[PDB]
Write a protein that binds this DNA or RNA. Sequence first.
RNA 1: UGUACAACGGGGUAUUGUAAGCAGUAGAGUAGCCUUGUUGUUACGAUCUGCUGAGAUUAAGCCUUUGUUGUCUGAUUUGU
RNA 2: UCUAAGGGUCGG
RNA 3: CGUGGAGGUCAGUGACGAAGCCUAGACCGUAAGGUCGGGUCGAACGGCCUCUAGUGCAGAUCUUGGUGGUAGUAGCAAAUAUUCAAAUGAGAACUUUGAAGACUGAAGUGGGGAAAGGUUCCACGUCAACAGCAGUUGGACGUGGGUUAGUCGAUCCUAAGA
Lengths: 109, 71, 380, 50
Amino acid sequence: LKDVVTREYTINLHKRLHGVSFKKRAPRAVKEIKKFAKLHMGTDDVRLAPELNQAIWKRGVKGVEYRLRLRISRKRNEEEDAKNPLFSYVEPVLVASAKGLQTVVVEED
Amino acid sequence: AMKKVEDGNILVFQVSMKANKYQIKKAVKELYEVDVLKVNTLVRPNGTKKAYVRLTADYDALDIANRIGYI
Amino acid sequence: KDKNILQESVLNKYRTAGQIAQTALKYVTSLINDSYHSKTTQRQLTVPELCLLTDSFILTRLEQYYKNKVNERGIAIPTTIDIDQISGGWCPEIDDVTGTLRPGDLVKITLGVHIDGYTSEVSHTMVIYPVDETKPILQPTGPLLGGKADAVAAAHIAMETVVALLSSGITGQLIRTIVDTIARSYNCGVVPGSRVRRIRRFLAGQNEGIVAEFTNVSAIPSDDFVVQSGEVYLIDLKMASLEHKAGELIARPGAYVRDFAQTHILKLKTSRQLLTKIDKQGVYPFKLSHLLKSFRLGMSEISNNYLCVESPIQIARTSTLVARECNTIVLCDSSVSTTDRPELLRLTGGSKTCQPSWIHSQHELNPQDSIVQGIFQLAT
Amino acid sequence: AAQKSFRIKQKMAKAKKQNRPLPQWIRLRTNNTIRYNAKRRNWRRTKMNI
RNA sequence: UGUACAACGGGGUAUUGUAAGCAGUAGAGUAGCCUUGUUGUUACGAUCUGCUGAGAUUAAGCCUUUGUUGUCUGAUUUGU
RNA sequence: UCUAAGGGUCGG
RNA sequence: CGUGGAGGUCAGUGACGAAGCCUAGACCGUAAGGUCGGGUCGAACGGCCUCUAGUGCAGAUCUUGGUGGUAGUAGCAAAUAUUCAAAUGAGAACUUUGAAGACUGAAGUGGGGAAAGGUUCCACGUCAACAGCAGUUGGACGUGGGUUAGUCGAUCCUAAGA
C-alpha cells in the first residue's frame, strides 16, 4: 500500500561522516540524511526543511553534530504526479541532547 | 523628454549640428513666439545635437508643446 | 443575478433620463441655424458651441433630479453633430477646426443621458434654416426635396419599421432585412455593419445587437438573436444616399470609452493618472474636450493598449448625405385581461420625431412589387 | 577615452549607426541577392583602429 | 516471516585524563561598609579541593544484544 | 594578585 | 589509344531524353581504350578526313579544397566552498527571492580615475549561434532609451623639442 506515517529518528552522522574531506562534510550530511529518509519508509522523494539545513550547517562545513534527532513524516504528493505518490519531509526536533533516544512513532492529530 | 515638458518647463529639440546656444535660443524665440531662460545642449551619440530649452515662467511648455502639435 | 431583475424604479430612471435627452435634443435643434442667421441675433453657431451647450445642459438637468442622493448621473454619449456626408461622432476639441452650420445643411445630432447608469440615447436629423424673423414663413412653406429628402424619409421609415419589429419574440435579422428593403425603396443604403446595442445598467454596448446591411463576413461574425421581455435597446438607424461604406478620412477621434474588460500596466505617469481620471467618469463614452494637452498624451498609451475604445469620425463620399434616427425602447411583457404579450415603450420621445410633411421624395415604399409587399402594411 | 575629440566621436557615431541587422524588406526586392549584413561589426570581435 | 535483516538504544572493549553545574572559614592579595570582629560581612581573584578514574568518543572494516522501530516478490535473460 | 617610580592645570 | 578547341563531311544523335554520373550486368581490343544494357539525370552532343595545343599523374616534405584512423581518446584538477527551500519556466546543480555556510579583509574581491576601448551603460523582449557542462542567465541576439557646465577639462602659457 502507501500509509502516511511520521516517526522520530536519531541518525548517527558521525559514523557516516568518518573519513570525509572537511570541505565535503556538511554537504555529505545533507545527502546522507536523504539516504536515511529513503531507507526508512522507502520514499525516494525526500525533502529537507530549511530549519534542518540550518541545523546541519550550524557549525559550518566541518563541524556537523554527531547525532541528529530528526522528524521524518511520509506524506502524500500533490500536483502533476511526479513519479511517486509519496513523500518524506524531514525536520529537526528541538531536544536537549540527541543521545539516549529510540525511534518513536509520533501519533498524528 | 516628454516628462521634461510636463515637469520642467523645457522644450526638447534636435537642432542643427552647426547651431549654438545663441542661434538656437533666437530660432526658438521666433518660430514659437516664446521667451527663453537658458539653453543647454549636448551632442547625442548618434551624431545629432539635442537642445534643452527651458522657457521663462510666463510660458507653459506643455501648452506650447501641443500647440506645435505633439504629446 | 440581480434582485430585482426589473423594477418600477428602474423604468422611472430610464424615463427621466429620456425626458432630459428629448429636451436637450429639441433645444439644440432650435439653436441650429445658419452662421449668418446666428449673427443677426448676436450669437454664433458652430460644430463646437452646440456640442458644449448640449453637454452642459445634460449635466445641469441631471443635476436637478435625485438631489442629495448617493448616485451618478450625467452624460452617456457626448453631444455629437455630424453634418451632410459625415456619419457620426463629430465632437470637436477647442483646437480642432470647428464647423459653421450653413442654410440647407443636413445635420445629425446624437447624444445620450444616464441616470444611475440607466441610459437614454437619442439621435435626430433635420435640415438647417435661416432665422425665422428674417424669412418669416419661407422655410415652412417650403419642403426639402432631392437626395436629402430621399435619405431622411428612408431613415425615418427604417426607424418606424424598427419600432414595430423590435419586440419580444422577433429576431434581430427581421429588422436588418426590413431596413434594407425600406432604404432601397429610396435608392438609399444603410451604412454597412453599424450596430444597435442592448442596454444594461452601466453598459452602453451590450453584446446582443441588431446589425445594419452586413457584408457576407459580417453576417458570419454577427450573432442571430431573439428579443425578449425586459430588454432595452438603443435602436440606431444610419442611412446613406451613397454606397454605404463609411470610411475614416483623417479626422481626429475625440470620443472614447474605457473598456473594463482590458487591463494593462501603463509605463508613463501621465497615462496612469489619465486612466485614473477617466475611471472617475460615469458614462462609458466621453469626449476629450472634457480634459487639452495632458489628455492628448495620456490618450495615446491608453488607446494603444486597448484600455480606451475610440469612436472614430467616419464619412461617406463627398456630396452624399447620411441621415440618422436613434431611439431608446423598453421591451417588456404586458399581462392585460389575462393575456401576456410583449409591448415596447419608446423613451426618446419628441426628440426623435421628425415632421413628415417637410420632406417630399420622388419615391415611396412599393407594396405591389414582389420586392416590397408587406412593408407598406407594416408601416401603416 | 572619455575626453575624446570630436573627430573621434563623429567616427564613433557613424560607426554605431552602421551597426544594425539588414532591413528585412530588402530581401523582398526584385532580383535581390543580399541575404544579410555581411559587413557587420562588434566591439568584442574586431577593433575599429580609431 | 527467520536461530532473518536493518536503524536506533543497551552492555562490553577502547581512547583521553577528571565534563557542565553547584559548593567550600582552599586561595597571593587589594579595595569598600559597618553593629569593629573568641569565624564581621561586601566586591574582585589566576588557581585549588569535593561531588569525579569523571565527562566526551568508541566501527566508520571492535565484540555483544530477551529492548524500540521498521523491512520482506522491482528489472532482465536463459533449454539438450 | 599586588608594590614602587615616571605628568598637567589652577589657588599661596 | 585518349582530351580542349578549328576547317570539311555524315542533310549524324537528342526533351518520345543530349551531356554527366552509378552499376563483383553484357560484348570488342595484347593494351592505351571502345561499345551496349539498366538506374539517375535534364540541353545539348558525336563518328570519319583534316587542323591546332595551356592535351593524359601516384608520387614532387607538390597547390587548393574536402575526408579518415587516431577517439568519444588527451583532457575540461591553480586562485579554501558550498547547502536548504520557494518562485519562475516546456525544462533548473548553474536564473531570481529567502535562509544558511563562507571569502576578499581596506596594501580589497570596496569606492573612483589616466591611457585604451567605443555603447560594452539602462530598459523591454529574448536563446539559433557564442559564454570548451548547462542556461530561463549575459559584456550575447532584437528593439529602444541615455551623456545637460561662465565656475570640471580642453581652449591660453611656456618646457625638451617641433
